[PDB]
């Protein structure tokens, strides 16, 4: 069917270099580009006791990650998708999909 590209990453300004810039190559150039707005951004929240012993004021922390899921859609590339997913190499945890 229609191929979509989800790019999942810890950090912004890796995914940004993927979607905006390197979709220009697929924009009307070989296939048509339907931009929605990217999916909700999860948090992975963890709570860790600061103190390594039982004497403090029983303090804790709040540590958070951002999970950026950047979704943009295309209309049925086949064999062209090879180009699309070879374009980013610019950061770790840049993963791309083909339906």
């Amino acid at each position: 069917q229609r191929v979509l590209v989800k790019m999942t990453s810890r950090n912004a300004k890796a995914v940004e270099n993927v979607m905006t810039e390197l979709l220009l190559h697929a924009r009307n150039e070989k296939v048509v580009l339907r931009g929605p707005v990217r999916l909700p951004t999860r948090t992975l929240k963890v709570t860790t006791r600061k103190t390594p012993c039982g004497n403090g004021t029983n303090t804790w922390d709040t540590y958070e990650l951002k999970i950026y899921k950047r979704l943009v859609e295309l209309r049925a590339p086949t064999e062209l998708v090879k180009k699309i997913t070879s374009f980013p190499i610019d950061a770790g945890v840049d993963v791309a999909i083909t339906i």
Partner: peptide, 18 residues
């Protein structure tokens, strides 16, 4: 990362800002 506490043993990509 709590048999080696994460405050000491970071670079898992977590941060505290709030």
């Amino acid at each position: 990362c709590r048999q080696c506490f994460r405050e000491n043993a970071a670079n898992i990509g977590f941060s505290k800002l709030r």
